[PDB]
Amino acid sequence: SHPLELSEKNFQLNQDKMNFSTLRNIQGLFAPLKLQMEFKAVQQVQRLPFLSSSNLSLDVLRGNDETIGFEDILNDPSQSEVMGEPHLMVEYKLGLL
Amino acid sequence: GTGYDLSASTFSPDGRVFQVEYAMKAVENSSTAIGIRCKDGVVFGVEKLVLSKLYEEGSNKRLFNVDRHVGMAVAGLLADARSLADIAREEASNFRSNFGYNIPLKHLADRVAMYVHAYTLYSAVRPFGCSFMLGSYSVNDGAQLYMIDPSGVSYGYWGCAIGKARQAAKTEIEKLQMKEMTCRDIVKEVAKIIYIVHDEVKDKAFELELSWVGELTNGRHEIVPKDIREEAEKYAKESL
Amino acid sequence: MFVPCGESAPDLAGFTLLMPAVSVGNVGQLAMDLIISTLNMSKIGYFYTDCLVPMVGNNPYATTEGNSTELSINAEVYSLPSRKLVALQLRSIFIKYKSKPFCEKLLSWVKSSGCARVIVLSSSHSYQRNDLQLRSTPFRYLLTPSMQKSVQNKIKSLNWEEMEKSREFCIRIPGGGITKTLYDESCSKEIQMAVLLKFVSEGDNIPDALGLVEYLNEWLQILKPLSSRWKIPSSWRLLFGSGLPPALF
Amino acid sequence: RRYDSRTTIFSPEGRLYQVEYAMEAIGHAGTCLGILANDGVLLAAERRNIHKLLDEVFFSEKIYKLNEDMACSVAGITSDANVLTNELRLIAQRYLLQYQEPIPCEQLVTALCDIKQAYTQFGGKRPFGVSLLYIGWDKHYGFQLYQSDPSGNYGGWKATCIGNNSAAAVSMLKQDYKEGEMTLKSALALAIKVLNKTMLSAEKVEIATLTRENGKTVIRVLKQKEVEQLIKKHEEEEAKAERE
Amino acid sequence: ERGYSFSLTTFSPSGKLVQIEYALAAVAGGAPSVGIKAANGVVLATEKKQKSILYDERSVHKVEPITKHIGLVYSGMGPDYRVLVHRARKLAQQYYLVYQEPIPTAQLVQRVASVMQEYTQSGGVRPFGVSLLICGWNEGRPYLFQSDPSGAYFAWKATAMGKNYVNGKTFLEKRYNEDLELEDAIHTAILTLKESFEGQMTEDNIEVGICNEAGFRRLTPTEVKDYLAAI
Amino acid sequence: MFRNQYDNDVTVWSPQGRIHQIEYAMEAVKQGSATVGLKSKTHAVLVALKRAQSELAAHQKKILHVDNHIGISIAGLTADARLLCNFMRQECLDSRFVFDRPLPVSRLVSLIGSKTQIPTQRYGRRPYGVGLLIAGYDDMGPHIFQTCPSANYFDCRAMSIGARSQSARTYLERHMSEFMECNLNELVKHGLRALRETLPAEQDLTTKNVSIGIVGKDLEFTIYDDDDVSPFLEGLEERPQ
Amino acid sequence: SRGSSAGFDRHITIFSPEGRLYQVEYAFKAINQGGLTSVAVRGKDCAVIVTQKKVPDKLLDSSTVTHLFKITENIGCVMTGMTADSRSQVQRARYEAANWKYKYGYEIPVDMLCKRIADISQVYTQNAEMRPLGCCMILIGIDEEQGPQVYKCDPAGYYCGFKATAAGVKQTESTSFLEKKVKKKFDWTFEQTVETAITCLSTVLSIDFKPSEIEVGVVTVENPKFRILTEAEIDAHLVALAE
Amino acid sequence: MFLTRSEYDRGVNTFSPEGRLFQVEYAIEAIKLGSTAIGIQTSEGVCLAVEKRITSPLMEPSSIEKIVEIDAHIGCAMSGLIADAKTLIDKARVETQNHWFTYNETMTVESVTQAVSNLALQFGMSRPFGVALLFGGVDEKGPQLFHMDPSGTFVQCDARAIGSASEGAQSSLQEVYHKSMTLKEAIKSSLIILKQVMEEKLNATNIELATVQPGQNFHMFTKEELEEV
Amino acid sequence: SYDRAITVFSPDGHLFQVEYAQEAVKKGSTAVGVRGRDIVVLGVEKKSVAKLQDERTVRKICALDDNVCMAFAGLTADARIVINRARVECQSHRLTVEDPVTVEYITRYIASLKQRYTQSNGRRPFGISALIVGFDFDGTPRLYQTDPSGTYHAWKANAIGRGAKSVREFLEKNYTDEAIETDDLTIKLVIKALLEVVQSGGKNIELAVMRRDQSLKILNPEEIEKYVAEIEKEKEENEK
């Protein structure tokens, strides 16, 4: 489709890969290891996926707590127009589907 | 510290982490290794207890070559030591690829010490139960010796000893005045200290292991030749 | 039932009975070991019941080559007739629905024999302390109403802390085993009794035993007052297991 | 005990103790009442936030509007009730967007009870300590009244009560409710009588009614003057009855 | 007894959540805060925790602005307060971007309370040990809200929180009047703070902020000195 | 008595500086049957012993095939052996497909050790309860290796692992001075003599409970079983007693 | 993961009946495990940091023992507490400064760096998987519009700005001494600031100092780069006090 | 010298002081609550005999499907928790169908065995399965027989008995079995073993047989064929 | 002491949490199902009746599709979740392929969904049991039962819930080929089986009827009382 679809879909992953590669080259193997441990730990305390979360700790760790982008004001995910059944979404999150 | 010593993310009522202390206590279950820094090189020495006669000579060595110019001696749990040696090799190779010249010993020591420290913060992993020493020589920088313990702390030394009898070894090392000697003069002293520290009643037999890096080898880490090692062993035995 | 080692039961009248409880960390049992080893008491009988898991072994206080081959069972009675002291030791744990019958039988024997008073060494969980208990001493005590006035005067002089009540008021000792049942039955049967416990956590619990025995000595004065003094039994070896396998370190 | 620390444990006789403990949290909340009549539905609540230094800056407390045709009342934990009411509004709007017709009254209750049941089904989470009363109108069954509980159960009623002192109110409603022969005025009088027995001033109650006019649903909240009129009428009729 | 005191996602047999009560206990042991809503304005006051000459007087503040017409104060723990303040500022900016008008006070209070309600229903975290007083001016009408560690908010005319807040609320009940001016409100707030200071009150150990039709602002120490001298 | 708190997980250190779960996993090796490995100047030989259970209900494969010049034998759990065999086969296949050159045995053993060290430091996992004897031939000659549940490996001239393997080890260390000069037949006979020392002193080796695997300079790894073993067993003498 | 431990002082995310965090309070006690104390003083146009240097082993190379670090060209640091934790925080601070420079196009200020570190430290006290570091940071720098700056952050996530501060085993006596001196006099020259810091250390610890036992770093308006003094300069200052 | 409690049998990742995993052993012991099954390997074919237990006469004696048949000339038999075999069957069928769709021949019994054994080993589902399987079929190598237990690994055999009463069945089968026999002889032997193991009668509604041999495809015996014997 | 976790075996090979879920099932209202030559009947006991309740919202019999219907015993919210999932699955299958859904297919789907929730320690099983009846494409009646563990079977007549053993024994005694010849006799058999445990017949008995190529029909209290009166009359005649 549009050339911008794939770029916008996976922006955060590519940013993480670039920063992690630079950090590994400058400091060593321990710094990305610690960063990934912290991200995994804080990304584990949230609401069940059919409700709306806030991700306060993850935003504090990642540095997104004084920045607003186009993904924060356009097509607000809190007021989504489609939502599945609760049990189905929880099962899909765990990989059973 | 009963009641506060099951995780590495727990503090005791006086501000201690006891899992790291137990990991450091695990290093005294192994045999002694010493390292002496000289005027023109660094000499390593390890007493290796022989377990059986069915093993090939040169097996389960405790002196490694993490690069062409760096030597490494280990004590404690062996699998952890091998993993740390692989990590050190990766770091040296990455630095060589990025910058095009040999990594200084200080930067390698820091990069390995921080990796060791990263394992003392979470409850999902376990601290490393091992210690090791790094030695190098270069005409621009001279001799250098470092030591890292399971907590993640590294320092530079003039003479170091790790293992089950490190206190007696340090007492013997502190009466040498090694800042003016030569490597060939200190090989004999290292062998003598290893022989005087060993205990025969509990440990049956051991095989002495020696190596240096210095000016006489153009800054390369190598095993001591057989004749020099034999002469040093004879000198130590007749000194006993 | 108290079955004597010989043919006739000893005469106990006015004796002081010391006994542990099977509680968290085995602190009372370790303290009883320390006391029996240090004072060098002598076995006089057995307490044969149906309430503890059976176990057997050789002499736990061996010193010479002659007394090192004496069989021992899970419950034994030691006496020191010179100073009117008698001590009971339990070396195993309790089967289900068996603690109350054991307490009833033991207190019946205590009443029938003719002892003066009973002192119980116990312990309680250390993770159930509040903020006020977190900044105070870990030693507590209890007393029955029937205890003689001299004991209360001495304890008040010693500046000790009494175990707090819990919300008609009752006492709860989490992790204490049979201590609460013993206290309740002794209160209902008019027997003098004192309880001495400590807040502990499970692990290596030898310093806890040393602290508890010194705490008890502050009142009993069994040996010289504090101003290498307790004998460690020869059985206190290999408390962590066998040796270390080779080709690992 | 050993079977009441998680929501994912069955007791040996097949009971979930955490859910029952959660339902125990509703007996401390204020009283909520609901009555069904031939020409309207009623909702009467008790105000707990009574104090001299409190402000009044909102439409009402413990009574919320979900869409053009429905309203609810809550009892339990306020912070959980807020989440539940927001989710109810979202569900109704989604159904309207997809089907171009207003949602039936029972489907909304079922959809919220599914969410309430998921939080008892899955581990690591805590069940909601909230109970709700619903009133509304739709073209399939007319006026309706439902009730819900923390476990995820619901049912239809003609008169029910939740909150503090619910059993006495239920007994009185059972004694005094006439099926098929009651109007909005009778429902208001009965609600006043039952609340007066179970708990009276106009500052401690709040009443809302639902009705249909010219093919349009009207939702109102009564005023202080009307509440005082009802209270004084009840008082005078009680005095007249007891004088004989 | 203590089995239900450690876990956040565990109900007591009587249907109570105890860790939330303990978080409120953490709040009640903080520094006192006072808020008074008068006609044509609101006033917020608090007691400083840095009572020494070594501390710098312009580094960290307890009274903060969220928008041009919204302010904030707290009692409890400061580190939680900072992250809550940052999130509130971001939410206000998002609302302005979407709707092209300043956010109302009630909507911001609702959003913040929604963020705070989470962390009380999940395992592996703890609730925020802090309460907030929020003031604002909107549509020619002042506002005053309070938010709890559990996520519940109330609308007040005058309130006190922190240490010795029951006696402060009694004092406010005795002294508060409907037809009050902003200057008299500031006087009454300072008098309420003075009831439990336990020391000598100056302009270097209290902080005051006001809100009116011109927006929210924090008073300078010279103005506080002038107000104190008038007592 | 004080070990109960520190011997449930692999991520807990003891106050004495020990990890008891690794030492417990090292005990699972002694639940398997005995196996013996030895080498000469040209060949490396593995011999295995099968359980006395009737062949009717079980066809056990103690000796497995990994590559054209590497073979292993097992003592311990079977699932871990399967996983390790799959990993080794994949490594050898990838190396051959990328570079047309055999994978060195030392490199393979180093990879195995690195792989097995990881589950000893991470929560939610357990060590591998299996030990291996590895025989191979490469540019450096023949090799014998030993693998442990503790992620340790050794370079051996002759080794035996399994249940009641101390007798085999004693025999091997007593007769270890003649292995280099022997040919294939003498080497296999020495291996069989070492293996039969672990049996009660009335049984004897038969063609139903013995497996043999040989590799060499010109001989690929081959497994002899059932009736193929009889030409090796025919020359063996009777018991000394 | 592993699972929390029951008790009112054994897990990070459990409140006590009085609303306290005993694990945070215990992490505050790890700062005294080293046994050393440090002092930071702010002057009219300069800022200094002083700490003591203990080398107990004869066989240890003394040039590799230090507690003074350089974050950027214009920011200095002194760490007190656990050594490995201190070094890890130094590395993290350098990373955060690099991110700020890349994102905004100019060098990070001292207060902003301290606030970022405190924000990161706050997260460790609210999640059950990670633990706080047992160390405290003190930063100095020169601001273009404001001047000298002294900042400090602690394991709880709390930070502040000071005129003079101390940390370590003997923080309270140093705080009292500095409070008396500050209430007495202001407007110190560059010499007087070092004099005051060394006097505070040498009075709180009843020791006469040698040039090899202390470590001094300075920043000044004329030369805004972080600098570490040498033994000759330290001895010159010491004889200046002695006369 | 005191007696204390110690437990090692609550987690699937815990080793006993003598190197034993007790949860796997308990899962294996769970098999002995099932019904007896017999399998015999002969040069002419493979015969699978299974036991069907009926709790009530009102139960329909046709929905108890214990001998499920997979394609590529492969049989099966089961004992234990019947609800646990569905994922294994689905994996086997999907693998076989993919092999057909990609190569256009039959996958070997050993290959399907290994493929289904890979999925049973993923508990290190968070628990081992509670069922045991028996596989049959013929290929270019000839007839083959395999057995699996809840430990997650397979093993080749030629005469195996699984179920609640399996030791006696194995003892009898060891005597009866011979290196050479006819397929009908094997069927008769299986029937007599089932007869002397069962506690009830043996009408055509109690058992279920599916003898597979290289001549034709899968052939589960019908009611008439079963009643013939 | 092996009943605290879902995925833990006991020393003799039992999973106790699933058995406790079965215990939860064993306390619901009794449900009875009988299949005949051209009709299938379902009957459910009504535990109690409140006068101020709308009875339409508490029914225990539902219709999954046009050729299948279901009754349950156990917890009610779990049953509602399962019913909604099955209905959505039937609708999706009918939309994708125009063929009518098979009763065995929907039973297998329900059983698989139930069995999914007994595999992990992070979720709990469904505490319900279901009875499923319907007609296939060729008009063959069917009757199935499902369990909380995930097993299923096929029956001719079965009962679940509280007091199920006596009902099952009565059905075993009285289920003959001459008792299901006609629809009225089948319905009378179902009512008579339910009357063994129900205190007052008709007052608190709910019954549903399904015929071939016809929609589900719920009998009214008038018809139920007429059938009860016929049973009473025949009992009086047979008294003698």
Residue numbers in the entry:
A (entry chain H): 45 to 141
B (entry chain F): 5 to 244
C (entry chain J): 1 to 167, 176 to 235, 243 to 264
D (entry chain B): 3 to 201, 206 to 250
E (entry chain A): 3 to 233
F (entry chain E): 1 to 241
G (entry chain G): 2 to 244
H (entry chain D): 1 to 124, 133 to 237
Q: What is written in the article reporting this PDB entry?
A:
Dedicated assembly factors orchestrate the stepwise production of many molecular machines, including the 28-subunit proteasome core particle (CP) that mediates protein degradation. The CP is composed of four stacked α-rings and β-rings, each containing seven distinct α or β subunits. Unlike conventional proteases, the proteasome harbors three different types of active site (β1 or caspase-like, β2 or trypsin-like and β5 or chymotrypsin-like), each present twice.
Structure 2 is distinguished by the loss of PAC3/PAC4 and addition of β3, and it explains previous observations from genetically engineered mammalian cells that β3 is the second β subunit to enter and this requires prior β2 addition. The β2 subunit grasps β3 with both a C-terminal extension (CTE) and the β2 propeptide, rationalizing why β3 incorporation in mammalian cells requires these β2 elements. Extending from the β2 active site Thr, the propeptide meanders, forms a helix crossing β3’s interior surface and extends to secure newly visible regions of POMP that co-fasten β3 in the groove between α2 and α3 (bottom left). β3 is stabilized by newly visible residues of POMP (residues 45–61 and 114–141) in structure 2 compared to structure 1. Residues 114–141 directly clamp β3 against the α-ring through an interaction that is also buttressed by part of the β2 propeptide (bottom). Notably, the regions of the β2 propeptide and POMP that clamp β3 in place bind the same α3 and α4 surfaces as PAC3/PAC4 did in structure 1 (zoomed-out views). Upon departure of PAC3/PAC4, α-ring stability may be alternatively supported by POMP bridging β2–β3 and the α-ring, as well as changes at the α-ring pore. The N termini of α1 and PAC1 are newly observed in structure 2, passing through the gate toward POMP. PAC1’s N terminus runs alongside α1’s N terminus through the center of the α-ring until PAC1 contacts a newly ordered region of POMP and makes a U-turn to terminate in the center of the α-ring pore.
